[PDB]
Write a protein of this length. Structure first.
Lengths: 135, 135, 135, 135, 135, 135
């Protein structure tokens, strides 16, 4: 997988696809990372990043983080320098897969599928969106 | 979501549903958690735990961790006992959603969808199974 | 040479081509490296790494190292874990070309050819396989 | 393999064979080594040397080094004592095979072939001759 | 922009394309750099290098330098060996684009075009080649 | 080269020629400089300046800088009088040619052409406009 564009669909009544241009690939410590480039200021750009640490005799790790910021919009007549905008708040998602040495390709398939199916579960969607726990 | 059984499909040619009995609900200090209860050994049970920390003025946090013990993959010569480190004989997935107070319902839906679509992406599938990163 | 797949033939009666997926390109500090990705275990993957340090006034250096884990050869009684030293359960080949600044293109071609012909020589083949030196 | 002459072909449009007389064989610490005996002075002679350390319970090692020097030629009318010549620069190739105890003859064949095929690869010839990396 | 070959036309009656093989991609402090690979010795290789510092809130900076070295041809008198070359002199071009936070994309286009056209201008060609100012 | 008008094409879908009336000829330390004269206030005038330091025995130096300022449009809130304009920001381009004593006239031509073509290159256009490095 050479680095290339990334297309992720937001959650709406009808999802609309959002595109992520690559900015830096994975070499050494630095992780591969993409930018959305949709917001008004350079700071509102939504970003994704990933790093695949392959440990030949040890615990390999895949780390992913997704950042969705929302900029601070002030009334139009008001005066805050547009050259200095701030981020009001930003949602974050951070996950890490930990795969032992000597794990079967089937074990890797297994855990990937468990993670994806769990995040697709009604209890998980319920918890993240409505803030509703499993009581 | 009252705590109840949880059904997650493994990754195979034909995926097979695996069931998760609940063990305890979510409390203020303990996270809700389930158990696979398939393998004969206490070790081979697969666990899934989740916790929804609501912060009425601050960053709420949903935390999820999935553990799949792969003892089949362990060589016959290696002995597994209480002192064997967990991260050496089982696969793990850990994610955390961070949701600031004042996030629109649409922001919550958005980040849930971004996470799920990203883990569905081919680049992620390729990186977790074939260990191949984005270079 | 943009980094791309690498195909190396093993030594058998009928040699069998083995493919090497690229993992990361060559950077100023990290060397370009590939992976075999054949054996089921993370350990059994065979790696090949290379780095070309250009010294515009001095001794440039090309460095290559090849690692073939032979876990089949390990006795059943011996356990292999993170603490097992690498050089005990895998074969290794490490070479370094040192090219001074001001070397004619013909000097570079020359030493490449001398190295390749020497490793092709029967004395080298005999010494590496049958452990028999030149006495 | 008793020590005997060595014939290595340089890299040219049409390679021309160069011969290496043996000077010292491998006994104890001292490695087997051959000399080209083609250059004008005794210091320009190109040399090859090899050592096969057989470790019965441990990591056996085959070490090879090839030295191609180019002497310093000064204008004929100029006066530098011909009894005291210097080497302007010299190219070097150094490789080490590391073979574990208990490695199959097939594993030894394998790694020898991987090394030879890799040094024969277009990316390797490109890197050593043109100073071109894998980017 | 993944790093790839770079083709630049020299200044002649009829310009001739010169190719620049990459040596180093930009990562951290280390800047992207390409080499000409035409002169025989490792020194004569011409070098182009660039570094893009993106400052998310501030003055971002693109820095570029072009180095055209010419090897010295010594006379008989000084008696430096024909084989050890030295660089006589080298022409240098070093530019820096400063792009502030609030800059329009059209502004970025504008200034790049002004720079290119100004290096095209008769006044600049006159000044750089004949050392004649604009009096 | 007596100082005279200077015409430079802006970067647009269709470039439009912009004229630069001279203000100052190069004399002593004071460098030649031209002004755009398009924005209404004396501040918005864009400025091009150049200085040719001919060093009869040493490294001669041509220095150039292009300043593209954009006037600020204030909102109603801060209540700076409509009549007093302020400069919001300005893009800057600054280059320096270094020509050593022994440089061939062909070498001067060469480096000027390399600079112009490199500012033409897709990598540089990409980097300056989208702040994307050559990774």
């Amino acid at each position: 997988a050479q680095i290339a564009n990334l297309i992720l669909a937001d959650g709406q009544a009808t999802p609309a696809n959002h595109t992520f241009v690559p900015m830096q690939p994975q070499t050494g410590i630095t992780p591969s990372q993409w930018l959305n480039k949709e917001a008004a200021s350079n700071i509102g750009y939504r970003k994704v990043s990933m790093f695949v640490k392959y440990v030949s005799n040890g615990t390999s790790k895949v780390t992913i983080r997704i950042a969705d910021p929302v900029l601070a919009s002030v009334p139009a007549g008001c005066c805050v320098d547009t050259n200095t905008p701030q981020v009001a708040y930003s949602t974050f998602f951070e996950c890490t897969f930990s795969v032992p040495y000597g794990a079967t390709l089937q074990n890797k398939k297994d855990i990937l599928a468990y993670a994806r199916n769990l995040l697709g579960t009604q209890v998980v969607t319920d918890a993240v969106v409505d803030m509703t726990p499993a009581w």
